[PDB]
From a paper:
The proteasome is a multi-subunit protease that is conserved between higher eukaryotes and protozoan parasites and is a key component of the ubiquitin-proteasome system which is essential for the maintenance of intracellular protein homeostasis. The core particle of the proteasome consists of 28 subunits organized into four rings of seven subunits and harbors the three proteolytic activities: caspase-like (β1 subunit, preferential cleavage after acidic amino acids), trypsin-like (β2 subunit, preferential cleavage C-terminal to positively charged amino acids), and chymotrypsin-like (β5 subunit, preferential cleavage after hydrophobic amino acids). Due to its essential role in protein homeostasis, the proteasome is expected to be a good drug target across protozoan infectious diseases. Specifically for T. cruzi, in vivo chemical validation of the proteasome as a suitable drug target was obtained with the Novartis compounds GNF6702 2(24) and LXE408 3,25 two compounds related to 1.
Due to challenges with obtaining the T. cruzi proteasome cryo-EM structure, we used the closely related Leishmania tarentolae proteasome as a surrogate (β5 subunit amino acids are 95% similar and 87% identical). Clear features in the electron potential map located at the β4/β5 interface allowed the ligand to be modeled successfully. Similar to 1, conformational changes within the β4 subunit occur with respect to the apo L. tarentolae 20S proteasome to accommodate the pyridazinone moiety with a hydrogen bond formed between the pyridazinone carbonyl and the side chain of β5Tyr235. Comparing the binding poses of 5 and 1 shows the central amide of 5 overlapping with the urea of 1, the pyridazinone of 5 occupying the same space as the pyrrolidine group of 1 and the phenyl ring of 5 overlapping with the fluorophenyl moiety of 1. A cryo-EM structure of 5 bound to the L. tarentolae proteasome showed that, like the previous series, it bound at the β4/β5 interface close to the catalytic β5Thr100, although it also occupied an additional hydrophobic pocket.
Author numbering:
A (entry chain M): 126 to 339
B (entry chain H), H (entry chain V): 55 to 282
C (entry chain K), I (entry chain Y): 1 to 206
D (entry chain L): 100 to 301
E (entry chain X): 2 to 205
F (entry chain W): 30 to 248
G (entry chain N): 1 to 220
Write the structure that this text describes.
């Protein structure tokens, strides 16, 4: 008997100049079996402008998510109503992961949102809180597939061809669909569907997107 | 160990063999595994003598306190419940199969099994001990419920005897107690009046033919009993 | 074991030496960490083992000695006192939650009359301690991989009555034997002596 | 990880790469591994990133409370000692940190290494991390106290570059900081692969 | 892991009447890099190329066993081995050693010289083949290479288009693998022509 | 991997999924797991691909040879005995797990061989990581004297249960029908997984990737 | 180590059904075949566990009590099913955090105001909600079948269709799960609250021609 | 697995359940564990299917060779002896309980048990399998020797049913074969006509009272079956 | 690892160095075991590891080369030949009953025209081998604890076209860095070069 279980799946985000897009696949896996093709537990709104995504053990992200949700309520009350910024929640999360150092949450988290200047950002974490800001991000079972592809299409460091324009939010979204789609094909623990959340100043669009069920 | 309990109309029988073994040696051949909790509520103990004696003494203590406090008889459910609590709180550190059985006037005779994990299950009869694995079929096949006290006593004695005739870890006497509206009747069948054993079953009198004499034929005769 | 310390006491001094090496696995960081800590004007402790323990243990002693000298109007503790305090601190640690201080000491001192009334021991004192809090007065002692080479060399050459100069010569042979025979480069040794006149650093030997 | 720092006449240089390995897969080519604690003190991160990030952040908080409590900046020796006392207190809790603490207090420039066991060493030159074994080769050979501040950053940058080139765990961007009387400056960031083409231009 | 000790990744992909096979260039002992000029490709003949990954000593040993086998084949049989035979052969050899395996993972590309049918085959270390139509790959960066090839690869690419996506894939993936890199060597193999190219990559 | 066989009135149907993993990555979306063994016998395998390929090849070859010696059709029970004897000798180390199905003079014959070399002749079977899921659709729907179509549908249905519920199984269903007279293998009898977003051609025009040197060679 | 085997559940139009064998085993030993493993919780919910019955019993008592007391002591509406399920899940999680895990997987059903609820929770505090749920070998054997029935009836199943498919699965579990018996109960949650059926059996088929002695013989 | 064999006057019955389990899943629910060695000599196999099938095939082969060579019938003792040899030579590498039973004209019907260590013991009846532990008392209590063929068949079916009603590792069909001077009669009782199971025993119809409704009394009523 | 060997090849020589240290656990037995073995007039192998393996492996190669030069009328094998023979011998051993020869080599040679007909490679050759039979031509290479210091130093300083004198200077910096930074005293290095004119011992560097 382990207190730890990997429930699999994959999150990815990409920041833009005035948006960030965040995605998680909805499969929740057990041992050698599949509990639900419709789990929305990976992505969790913290404030209107900040979300977290978590991979690993579904149980521990539920706990973590609630722990944060309450630190954020305390913060609101102790600061005359205002919500903590994405950067504050990002640092908060690092500190909470680390306070469990010893019996760690088995989550691989991302915090995403909008900075103060209104620019998208992503913080990715390891299990104890090492983070750093980045413009993109992917944790989970397909991470090691997706992450190099995003490297290639965003940064283009091995292309002579001059870098194309800044990616709009429609083009960014396509890019993550294409990369979730390829991952569902090849990582056996990712599939079913992807919930996308496009965070902007004007609110958060959701968008479901079917992946291949096998 | 073989312990069991059976309900009859208006009470219960508990029964047990008497052997306590340190593996393959018998340290006690006359243990009493039917342990009094209150006047009309008993447990049968299996597993670690130490553990089960400590719990029984603890539960019996609590239950006497409790009876003095509510000024009335104790229910078998209460005794089982306490036993279950303690068995479950200490499930990792003890080896302990219990049966709690007895008579209370509200519910008549009852039997509870509290096996190693600390489940508590209310049954018509219960078996416990290493020897119990031998009685499941015996009950399935030969136990009809609705027996009288006396029939039920004899049946439990038979059942224990069958078990301890095959379990190396059970043996000795068969102790029983009945528990109902009347006074408890304890009984102790000594081994040599056991209502069953293999050493006296006529179908185990003929020896297996293993030590055939050297012969000119394949026809099997018998064991070679003498040198000549 | 990588850092060898050596000490011996003659009639009028106790001389202590210890290898500068500080390592990280095989990477040699310096050959110039002084691991001989002066605890008082006439007391020093050559201490070997990982920086963490060695520094925390020595700084604890050095403080507590200093504390006690305040709370005692400037009076120097005797070397046997100090050594027993160190021993008891080591010993206590092996049965603590935290665990043994993995360090080995040579504690050396020179006991002078603390007042007109002091009938006590006068002269050089040297103690061998190990991390478990063994504590033994010895005329010489060593710790580390060189410990045994040197110990046999001192058994051959040491006499109770060496001059301070015969002592420098003898300590040099000790350091040299540790360079000749230990795989680990103890290239530079710090050397100090304690005398009636306190701790002198000795640069003539290394 | 490769980090190094050295004291010279002009101050302290500190240099680092930016790769964070999760064993064989590269989690980041962009970790910042010099933590700017105060504005007179830097620390490097090597080892467990969280451990270093967390306890260096604590150190920064202790440094700042010192300054509020006492009206004066903490010395490097104290700062390093604070961190060393933490890592010592937690020597049995498997922290992984190899850290440098560099700064310029009223006693001039000071450089300490503090590890996960509570070691605290003060030398003029250190390298730390998987790639240290490489960086010392390039560094030990070029290091002199009398380096200018270009020559010292060049030396520091090359040593990190050489570490990056050879050691699988080190990589990315070579960042160099200088620590001088008025604080520290971040001197430069360079991709280690641009540096390949600058140092070896065939 | 013994399969990761020496580092290195290889990948082959099919297009229309062509394939590309590509290796990274690194040779390590774990994180120590020993050389940056060790492409892992071997040319068997005009129409077959293979790469090995895994413990470098076994790459060397096994490649030499393969070259004995293939040169012997060509003498006895008076023709070039074909990629199907070649891969069957390999699989056979690896399976002989099933109970004490060669720590290698070959990746074979080939093209029937007539037809232009293209055959790729990668194997595990005991010689289970994997004969997909798209791309195969192996080594330290193999997760990431599947990432990239899935994404970038499409049916019926031409030598050039196919080279570009092979290179971008090898480099992007190798940039995420500590044990693979220093750019890559690639052979583009058509019916008519073999083209080798050394591709610039990161120096980390 | 999910393989399945059923006996029907005239023969045997086998089925398989087609995902070949490595680790937790799909190396091949469309591999053939239904091996030819004889003109009237097929095998599907699960377990360690290499072991399965070696073993079926070896036996296939032996039976080919035995058929020239004897002049007769291979019996499914010779196939099975050669397999179990081989697997038994390697004490499970050769981790092939086979469903073997053919039709001989004695009629349909379906069997499992487990890696340790136990067999179980039965009217429906499964092996593989998807085996339990698929077996459950067989227990739920199998009946005696199924028509060929009934049998194919059921085999597909069962394999779909693995495709959709076992991670190690997927892509599509292959089936093979074996009658007295002939053996009809049908790849993609069911394709229940296209791809749902059309691939996005990422444009990488020649010269895009920096080349240092180039050697061209004509043939 | 009395333990309970599979549980399976499915939502129909109108309610939820949950089914389980009435058996507790002790290792391989089928110990008690007449155990009512499904347990009602409050007025709208029921729960059943796979795994340690003792854990189950202690957990189910904790939850029953919490429900009953919240309601008796405050003039408040009984907890909804999601609320009870939430409680149970947090309870189970807290126990995994104390290294004192509740070693069961549980299925939970409930209905209130024609809103239905079906969820699963597992020893470590995994939880999930779906239109069908199973635990133990149910999850390997029956889910695929139940899932298949919900693909085919995407408008929801009727109670009869649902009960037809549940029954098909019980039969399959009976055949393929070793520690099982052909005695089942099924809880049905609907508007009205939850009823537990009397124990019932399913028809088994054992006379396929291929099961005959001659065919299954190892040696001719 | 439950396997057993019993002697009657002039022959033997072998019986077995049909289940093969990979722990807790049933891979085969219609295995045949009664394996023919010669015309009138069978084994029942328990333990590793692989191992036991390999030995039975080997022994059957040897025995056919041997029968062709001596031009006469084989004795059950010969079959048991060979089985014992092989079981003992490979005792460390196999899991294998065998019973060898059959009819030969010199010795009538015989039964040999060859358990895991490779002992070979000639008995009147023998039990093997995980399920056998449940039948020892059943035989001790209910088996009288001297039964007719037909009585003996029915008794072995009952015995298997009892065993597999409690052993999780046994189940399914009950296969029997008789072996005597006449032709072998195999039989297969499907589970749903099993002569015993717990799911149809009337003494296991009443449910244990575990889920009592919340009441103002200690009087136990019943399980709470409905929310209302 | 305790004994560091280093090599590098310029246009006209390959230069090889290796630490004299012979140890027994921590006891330094000598700093003067030549571990650079000449195999042929233009081939030498710096070999590190326990004396048992190192000597048996090198003596095997040296013999087999010599044997083969008999059975081939005085003709010198090429360096690539020899290196492949060594590789195959190492490799074969890791799958043998006896087990890997725990030794690491730098094989260096200088290939001269063996006859008028030899169109072969002329010049310096250097190979890195490891005990498993990895074999890689390299312009420089190292084994041992110093291996990495030196390798990065050579990556900084080595150029293909150093003079024989710039090479002595560069090798000296290499040896010196190994003394500065490895905890293990590699106090003395033997150094040899191979040139067109054969193996010269180099005493100017150590
Ligand atoms: O990077 C670390 N661990 C791996 C998991 C990432 C890691 C983790 C903890 C510490 C280190 N230290 C060093 O590497 C190192 C190496 C060489 C060197 O000179 N120093 C400075 C030093 C000075 C005096 C005494 C001891 C050391 N330090 C690394």
């Amino acid at each position: 008997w382990s207190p730890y279980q990997d429930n699999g799946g994959t999150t990815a985000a990409i920041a833009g100049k005035d948006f960030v897009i965040l995605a998680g696949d909805t499969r929740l896996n057990g041992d050698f079996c599949l509990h639900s093709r419709h789990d929305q537990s990976k992505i969790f709104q913290l404030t209107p402008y900040t979300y977290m995504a978590s991979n690993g053990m579904q149980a521990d992200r539920l706990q973590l998510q609630q722990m944060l949700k309450y630190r954020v309520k305390w913060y609101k009350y102790n600061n005359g109503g205002k919500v903590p910024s994405t950067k504050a929640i990002a640092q908060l999360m690092s500190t909470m992961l680390y306070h469990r150092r010893f019996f760690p949450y088995y989550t691989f988290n991302m915090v995403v949102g909008l900075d103060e200047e209104g620019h998208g950002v992503c913080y990715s974490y390891d299990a104890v809180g090492s983070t750093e800001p980045f413009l993109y991000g992917t944790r989970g079972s397909a991470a090691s597939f997706v992450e190099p592809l995003l490297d290639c299409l965003i940064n283009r460091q091995h292309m002579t061809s001059q870098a194309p324009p800044e990616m709009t939010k429609e083009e960014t979204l396509a890019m993550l669909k294409n990369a979730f789609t390829g991952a569902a094909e090849r990582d056996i623990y990712t599939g079913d569907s992807v919930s996308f959340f496009i965070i902007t100043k004007d609110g958060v669009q959701q968008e479901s997107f079917e992946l291949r069920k096998d | 160990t073989t312990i069991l309990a059976v309900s009859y109309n208006g009470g219960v029988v508990l029964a047990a063999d008497s052997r306590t073994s340190s593996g393959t040696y018998v340290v006690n051949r006359a243990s009493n595994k039917l342990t009094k909790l209150t006047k009309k509520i008993y447990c049968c103990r299996s597993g670690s003598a130490a553990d089960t004696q400590a719990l029984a003494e603890r539960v019996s203590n609590y239950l006497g306190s409790y009876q003095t406090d509510i000024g009335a008889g104790v229910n078998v459910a209460t005794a089982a419940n306490l036993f279950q609590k303690m068995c479950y709180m200490n499930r990792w550190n003890i080896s302990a199969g219990i049966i709690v059985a007895g008579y209370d006037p509200i519910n008549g005779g009852s039997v509870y099994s509290i096996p190693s994990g600390g489940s508590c299950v209310k049954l018509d009869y219960a078996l416990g001990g290493s020897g119990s694995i031998f009685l499941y079929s015996f009950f399935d096949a030969n136990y009809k419920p609705g027996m009288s006290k006396s029939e039920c006593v004899a049946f439990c004695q038979r059942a224990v005897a069958h078990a301890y005739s095959r379990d190396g870890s059970s043996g000795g006497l068969i102790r029983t107690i009945t528990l109902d509206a009347d006074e408890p009747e304890d009984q102790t069948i000594p081994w040599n009046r056991s209502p069953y054993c293999m050493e006296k079953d006529p179908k185990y009198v003929t020896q297996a033919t293993q030590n055939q004499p050297f012969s000119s034929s394949a026809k099997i005769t018998g064991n070679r009993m003498s040198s000549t | 074991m990588a850092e060898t310390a050596i000490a011996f006491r003659c009639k009028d001094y106790v001389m202590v030496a210890a290898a500068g090496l500080n390592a990280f696995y095989y990477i040699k960081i310096t050959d110039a960490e002084d691991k001989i800590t002066q605890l008082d004007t006439h007391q020093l402790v050559a201490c070997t083992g990982e920086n963490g323990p060695r520094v925390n243990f020595t700084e604890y002693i050095k403080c507590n000695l200093a504390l006690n000298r305040m709370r005692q109007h400037g009076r120097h503790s005797s070397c046997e006192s100090t050594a027993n305090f160190m021993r008891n601190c080591l010993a206590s640690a092996i049965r603590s939650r935290e665990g043994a201080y993995q360090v080995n000491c040579l504690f050396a001192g020179y006991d002078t009359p603390v007042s007109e009334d002091d009938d006590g021991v006068v002269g050089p004192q040297l103690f061998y301690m190990d991390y478990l809090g063994t504590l033994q007065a010895v005329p010489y002692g060593c710790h580390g991989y060189g410990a045994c080479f040197v110990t046999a060399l001192l058994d051959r050459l040491w006499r109770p009555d060496l001059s301070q100069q015969e002592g420098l010569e003898l300590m040099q042979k000790c350091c040299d034997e540790v360079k000749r025979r230990v795989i680990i480069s103890n290239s530079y040794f710090f050397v100090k002596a304690v005398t009636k006149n306190g701790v002198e650093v000795i640069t003539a030997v290394h | 990880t490769t980090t190094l720092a050295f004291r010279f006449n002009g101050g302290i240089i500190v240099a680092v790469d930016s790769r964070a390995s999760t064993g064989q897969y590269i989690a980041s080519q962009t970790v910042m591994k010099v933590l700017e604690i105060n504005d007179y003190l830097l620390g490097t991160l090597a080892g467990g990133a969280a451990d270093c990030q967390y306890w260096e952040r604590v150190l920064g908080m202790e440094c700042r409370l010192w300054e509020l409590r006492n009206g004066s900046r903490i010395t490097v020796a104290a700062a390093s000692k604070i961190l060393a006392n933490i890592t010592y207190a937690y020597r049995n809790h498997g922290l992984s940190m190899g850290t440098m603490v560099a700064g310029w207090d009223q006693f001039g420039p000071s450089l300490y290494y503090v590890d996960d066991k509570g070691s605290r060493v003060k030398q003029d030159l250190f390298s730390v991390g998987s790639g240290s074994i490489y960086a010392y080769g390039v560094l030990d050979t070029g290091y002199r106290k009398d380096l200018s501040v270009e020559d010292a950053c060049d030396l520091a940058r090359r040593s990190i570059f050489h570490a990056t080139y050879r050691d699988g765990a080190s990589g990315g961007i070579v960042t160099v900081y200088h620590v001088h009387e008025k604080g520290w400056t971040k001197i430069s960031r360079d991709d280690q692969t641009k540096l390949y083409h600058r140092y070896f231009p065939s | 892991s013994i399969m990761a000790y020496s580092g290195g990744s290889v990948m082959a992909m099919a297009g229309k009447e062509c394939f590309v096979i590509i290796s990274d260039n690194r040779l390590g002992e774990q994180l120590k890099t020993i050389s940056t000029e060790v492409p892992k490709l071997h040319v068997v003949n005009d129409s077959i190329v293979y790469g090995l990954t895994g413990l470098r000593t076994d790459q060397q040993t096994f490649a030499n066993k393969v070259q004995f086998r293939t040169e012997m084949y060509k003498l006895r049989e008076e023709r070039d081995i074909t990629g199907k035979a070649f891969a069957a052969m390999i699989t056979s050899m690896l399976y002989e050693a099933r109970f004490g395996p060669w720590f290698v993972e070959p990746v074979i590309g080939s093209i029937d010289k007539s037809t232009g049918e293209v055959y790729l085959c990668a194997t595990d270390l005991i010689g289970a083949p994997c004969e997909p139509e798209d791309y195969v790959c192996a080594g330290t960066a193999a997760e990431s290479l599947h990432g990239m090839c899935e994404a970038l690869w499409r049916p019926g690419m031409s030598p050039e288009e196919l080279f570009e996506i092979a290179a971008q894939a090898m480099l992007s993936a190798c940039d995420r693998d500590s044990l693979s890199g220093y750019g890559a060597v690639a052979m583009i193999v058509t019916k008519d022509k073999v083209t080798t190219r050394l591709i610039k990559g990161r120096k980390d | 991997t999910t393989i399945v066989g059923v006996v029907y009135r005239d023969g045997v149907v086998l089925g398989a999924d087609t995902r070949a993993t490595e680790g937790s990555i799909v190396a091949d979306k469309r591999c053939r797991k239904i091996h030819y063994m004889a003109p009237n016998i097929m095998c599907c395998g699960a377990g360690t691909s290499a072991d399965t390929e070696a073993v079926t090849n070896m036996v296939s070859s032996h039976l080919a040879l035995h058929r020239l010696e004897t002049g007769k059709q291979s019996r499914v029970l010779e196939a099975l005995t050669l397999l179990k004897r081989h697997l038994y000798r390697y004490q499970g180390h050769v981790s092939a797990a086979l469903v073997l199905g053919g039709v001989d003079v004695e009629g349909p014959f379906l069997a499992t061989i487990a890696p340790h070399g136990s067999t179980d002749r039965l009217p429906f079977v499964t092996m593989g990581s998807g085996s339990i899921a698929a077996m459950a659709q067989l227990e739920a729907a199998y009946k005696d004297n199924m028509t060929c179509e009934e049998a194919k549908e059921l085999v597909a249905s069962a394999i779909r249960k693995g495709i959709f519920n076992d991670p190690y199984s997927g892509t599509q269903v292959d089936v093979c029908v074996i009658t007295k007279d002939k053996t009809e293998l049908t790849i993609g009898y069911d394709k229940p997984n296209e791809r749902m977003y059309p691939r996005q051609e990422v444009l990488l025009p020649p010269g895009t990737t920096p080349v240092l040197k180039e050697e061209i060679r004509q043939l | 180590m009395a333990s309970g085997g599979s549980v399976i559940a499915i939502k129909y139009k109108g309610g939820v059904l949950m089914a389980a064998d009435t058996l507790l085993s002790y290792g391989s030993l089928a110990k008690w075949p007449n155990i009512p493993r499904i347990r009602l919780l409050g007025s709208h919910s029921a729960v059943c566990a796979t795994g340690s019955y003792a854990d189950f019993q202690m957990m189910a008592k904790q939850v029953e009590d919490n429900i009953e007391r919240q309601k008796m002591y405050h003039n408040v509406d009984e907890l909804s099913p999601s609320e009870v399920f939430s409680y149970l899940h947090r309870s189970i999680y807290q126990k995994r955090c104390d290294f004192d895990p509740c070693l069961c997987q549980m299925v939970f059903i409930g209905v209130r105001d024609g809103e239905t609820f079906l969820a699963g929770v597992d020893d470590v505090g995994t939880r999930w909600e779906d239109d069908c749920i199973a635990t133990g070998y149910g999850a390997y054997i029956a889910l695929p079948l139940l899932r298949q029935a919900l693909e085919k009836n995407p408008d929801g199943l009727s109670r009869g269709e649902a009960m037809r498919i549940l029954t098909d699965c019980l039969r399959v579990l009976f055949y393929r799960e070793c520690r099982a018996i052909n005695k089942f109960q099924v809880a049905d949650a609907a508007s009205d609250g939850v009823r537990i059926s009397e124990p019932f059996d399913v028809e088994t088929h054992w006379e396929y021609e291929g099961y005959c002695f001659e065919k299954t013989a190892i040696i001719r």
